[PDB]
Amino acid sequence: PDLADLFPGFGSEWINTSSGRIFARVGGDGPPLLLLHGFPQTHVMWHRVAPKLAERFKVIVADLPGYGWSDMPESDEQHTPYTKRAMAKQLIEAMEQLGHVHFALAGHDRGARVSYRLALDSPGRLSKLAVLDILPTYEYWQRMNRAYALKIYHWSFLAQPAPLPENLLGGDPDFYVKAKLASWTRAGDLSAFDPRAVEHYRIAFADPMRRHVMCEDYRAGAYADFEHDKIDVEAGNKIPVPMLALWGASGIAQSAATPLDVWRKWASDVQGAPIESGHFLPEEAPDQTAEALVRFFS
Amino acid sequence: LADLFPGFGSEWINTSSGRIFARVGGDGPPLLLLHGFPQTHVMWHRVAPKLAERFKVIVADLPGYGWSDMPESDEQHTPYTKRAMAKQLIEAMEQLGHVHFALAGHDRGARVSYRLALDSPGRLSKLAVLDILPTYEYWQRMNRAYALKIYHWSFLAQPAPLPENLLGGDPDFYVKAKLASWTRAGDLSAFDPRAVEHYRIAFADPMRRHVMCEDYRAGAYADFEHDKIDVEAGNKIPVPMLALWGASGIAQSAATPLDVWRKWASDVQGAPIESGHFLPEEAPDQTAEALVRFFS
Incomplete structure (x- = not known):
């Protein structure tokens, strides 16, 4: 009644792992499918697409470690718990608590980076993989x-040593999260988002400890995550899992390169398509995003 | 605020784009000294007295910085491009009767300086730049x-009001963080506390902080374009030039400075100095001696 429930019919679950609890909304029946959000959002970003997926799948919509209502493991000098390798291990442990050792996976933004690192480290856990509007960190x-x-x-700003980004973000946190949401949409304002979802994102960003976690995520993104990717690319390791790459026609991934061509160097069985949208595919273009995921996973 | 230039006069020079504040001392050939970010003219307070023994020293606040006026910016950040700043400083010097002068700049002021030399070489007898490479x-x-x-080159260049809103929460933290982080020691020990107060009070004005972001916005767009045309056309600076850099400074992180400046200038000398970015305050005696020797 403070924050709205945007997943009618879904249960709420606190899943224990050796690093802390993972919060997730769970709905549907059928094969398991894990959905992972990114920055500066929470699990509620999937609220327009999850009901359509719950028609065919058991959908698990989880807050990343340290994000949303999941617990925040204590970081260290190498940002270990917020490396994508560590987040992937923690989420594998969470899924085992539910009895899911072979599942489908879709991620957006930071959650897509957890997802492809999971596929490189532990491919036997995945039936199929979908990444939304990213290229590999490397x-x-x-x-x-x-x-x-x-x-x-923000990849270089948020990776500066503490407390510099933390102190600056505290200067106007409401402004910063709203500016990031608006600036990466095709419209350029907040009109694509459900205002109730925006409130979820704004409340999470209001907590100083949550902002510090996000900076640790980007610090790992500039250091350990890059080194982990470098090993794979120099060894010629590829993702063996069937994979779908979606990107926004005016999103982030297409500025760097031709996404489908990049992912071919990283994966042996990948298909892709552009969606008429900015960065936030599941909220700017939910019907097109859900159609493409439904067809791919089934 | 302390007077860190005993015996120097104070001048408010009119130009078409607003007044330039400067301290003036000494006698002899004219020498203009330009500061950078996040500082003001007082950064020269340990070196200008040695220079004043031999030169007419003019220690100026950049357009929009310190006590100089702040021309209103536009969508291309024109008044805070280095091309525009150079033109404004040429007009200021003409008001004093100086149509041919020597010039030394640090950080942003060094970028005004080498752009002045590319646009209007006849105005300069000699040029020195401290701890920079060209923006390109x-x-x-x-x-x-x-x-x-x-x-900070990409953060401060983000569209307004994003950097301005974040800087406004705790301005004192950011200015001291930048002063400390670019010194060899990593703290504020190299600065005179009275000079730090000058930099802190300047940074506390929201209009002054907006100017600094406009300077960085120009640095990411028009300044880069202007440099690109010169390098792709093979235009080199013809003025005799000195490039000084700190062994622990910014310029040497990107490359070997002297090799880079030889691409941009036909008569360049260069020397390292054991210092971080802030040569005139971290290494005053070595900096002053290098400048006196070159300019004489």
């Missing part, structure tokens, strides 16, 4: 130039 | 490692 850094440095400035 | 070269070498080192 590719963003290797294509770093003037134009991309300006477009994804 | 910073952007051309912007890889992962450098993007993390000079993140």
